[model samples]
Target: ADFEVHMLNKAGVFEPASLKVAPGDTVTFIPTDKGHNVETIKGMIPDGAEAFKSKINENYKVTFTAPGVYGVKCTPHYGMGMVGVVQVGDAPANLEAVKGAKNPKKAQERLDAALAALGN
Candidate 1:
């Protein structure tokens, strides 16, 4: 089944910043407010997974084809803590890589917490 993540303007965050999905499942990003765009972070996605980005204010849908962790950030508000994580499939083969990637201060905090909940 597909899942939804909301870009909330007031919170400046992706509601449900952490999510899980089976491989091949789709996730839809809905912009509840404007000026938010979703993009993949370098070194965060599985080796062969396709990187993606969304136009500001657009509802974007992405299908997770690989089994691993996906680090996502909103380009314009990334430093302001607009970040999220998506774990696809049972075995997250690149957990260490995701943990090692550097992020903006608030983004790092969010990521750390999300990963912890996912049993990092």
Candidate 2:
């Protein structure tokens, strides 16, 4: 139960679109339905943290090793605003600067909202 969890569904959404974890914590992305893959958005991941993507119908696991913010999306559904965030160490260390990170217009809102919801 220590690991953070998210559910990706056929409707193209990730429950708990925003998640917070410690530096060493792991995130488990589950495919609640088909047509989903968890991948980090370009320029949205933490520095030094590895970026990863899961094949369709597969489980996605990401080990958060940096104390910053991470933006993720479902490749197939990203256009529908299917995205999420992983905030590490709860400090907003990278949140302030991630607003301009390159990402889809609609999807960027979802990603930005993740940090906004954090409220410092």
Candidate 3:
């Protein structure tokens, strides 16, 4: 089954803050509030994998084709800790790398909190 996570100030959180999926699975980020958006933390994606983001209130769909830990977050609310993680194939192959990713302003703390939820 596919996964759909929602975003908003009132509900400023990723439903499943830590998600585990297999390679080839898809995660859908749905921005239900007025200004929430989704994006990846720099250097947090798997090697050879590309990072992506979405405009405000947009729905972003990404396929976890690589096996690693991905740090995804909502930009406008990143300070309040709006972050999530997608683990492909349960390996978290890039956990350490993701942990060291340079994030946007007010993101590092939250991103750390997000990945930490996975026991990394």
Candidate 4:
């Protein structure tokens, strides 16, 4: 699968905010500048999940093999909305459960509730 991420200056936030992919798919996070990192905070493939801390003008790649919802954030930019979500395998179903989910906080709560109900 092909995905493009745009970073906002020193903000470190990514546009679109969310992404979906299937098992064995490769996802690439391309940064426009330096000092960016991709770190898995939750629901990750055992060997594929890890934080990528890199200087500006670098790229990182991760191949997801399991089926789950993964959360990623930039360490320095997290507070500024530098966060993203990756749903593998059953992404369509999971995304539908939280479509139009409100703000970040509320949307996250809704996502948590949905996952809990679905036993994710």
lDDT leader? 1
Highest-scoring model, TM-score: 1
Task: Give lDDT tens digits, candidate 3, residues 1-120.
Answer: 689988856538777777888888888998877778888867778986788989988888988888888888787777767778888876677877776676655567766666677667
Show where candidate 4 strays beyond 4 Å: 42-56, 91-120
Candidate number with the higher TM-score (1 or 3):
1
Q: Give lDDT tens digits, candidate 2, residues 61-86.
A: 77787888888888888887899888
**lDDT (CA) for every model shown?**
0.89, 0.78, 0.78, 0.57
TM-score against native, each model: 0.95, 0.88, 0.84, 0.61
Ranking by TM-score: 1, 2, 3, 4
Cα miss at 47, model 3 (Å)? 0.8
Kindly list the per-residue Cα lDDT of model 4 for residues 24-66, writing each as its tens digit.
8877777766666666543332334454454455676777776
Instruction: Give one clash count per candidate, in the order shown.
Output: 0, 0, 0, 3
Looking at model 1, residue 113 earns an lDDT score of 86
RMSD for all candidates, in order, please.
1.1, 1.8, 2.2, 6.7
For model 1, the stretches where C-alpha displacement exceeds 4 angstroms are: none
Clashing pairs in 3: none
